[PDB]
């Protein structure tokens, strides 16, 4: 069915967390657990703490996301 509420806000990478997970300070507001998207994993993409990246946010937990956009 897909809940269309998959929020597409941007963010500055803040921290290298373990296992492809990243504190990413959003341009909208707070920092959230933001794991790497599967697509990104497939195409390598070493994310570094200090990049502009777009996060896919749940409205149920807006403190947890998934980077969709490399750089």
């Amino acid at each position: 069915a897909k809940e269309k509420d998959t929020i597409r806000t941007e963010g500055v990478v803040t921290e290298a967390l373990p296992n492809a997970t990243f504190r990413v300070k959003l341009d909208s507001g707070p920092e959230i657990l933001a794991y790497i998207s599967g697509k990104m994993r497939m195409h390598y993409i070493r994310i570094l703490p200090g990049d502009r990246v777009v996060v896919e946010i749940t409205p149920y937990d807006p403190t947890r996301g998934r980077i969709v956009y490399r750089k």
């Binding site: 990478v13 290298a16 570094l48 703490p49 200090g50 990049d51």
Partner: protein, 168 residues
């Protein structure tokens, strides 16, 4: 340093000096040799290249020993504390950082020059800033026992500093 004795000496007329500094004159070699033999000492070529070659009467082995002493003693009581270098990464975390800082402190205490280096590999954008933030912080932490001599500086894939001890 590094001289020849008695019979190895190839010149004829040597300027002959006693052990005290007594100028016997410019003498033919054989006579000098004889004198040396008489003295219980040896004739030593201390200036081979000069006008009449400079020959001094001394106990040569003893002199050599003395030289070795004065050398090794003085040299290695004046021997430098070199450079101690420390490597980092940009993404660095707490415990490790603290350990590194401690190491640096130790080095400073000892008296050793500190090269503080961060390796990078690629995407040199957030690279310099974070490097500064780390290295500068480290320096600040050591601002009691250490002083910056070299500022935050690029090297290609690398960022370096040089810290000197506060009192050496």
């Amino acid at each position: 340093k590094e001289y020849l004795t008695n019979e190895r000496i190839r010149a004829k007329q040597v300027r002959v000096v006693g052990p005290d500094g007594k100028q016997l004159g410019i003498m033919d070699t054989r006579e000098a040799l004889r004198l040396a033999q008489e003295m219980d000492l040896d004739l030593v070529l201390v200036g081979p290249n000069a006008d009449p070659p400079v020959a001094r009467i001394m106990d040569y082995s003893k002199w050599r020993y003395e030289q070795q002493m004065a050398e090794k003693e003085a040299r290695k009581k004046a021997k430098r504390t070199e450079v101690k270098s420390i490597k980092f990464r940009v993404k660095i975390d707490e415990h490790d950082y603290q350990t590194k800082l401690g190491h640096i402190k130790r080095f400073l205490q000892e008296g050793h020059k500190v090269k503080v280096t961060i390796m990078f590999r690629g995407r040199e954008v957030a690279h310099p800033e974070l490097g500064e933030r780390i290295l500068n912080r480290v320096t600040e932490d050591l601002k009691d026992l250490a002083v910056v001599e070299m500022k935050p500086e690029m090297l290609g894939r690398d960022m370096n500093m040089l810290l000197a001890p506060v009192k050496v």
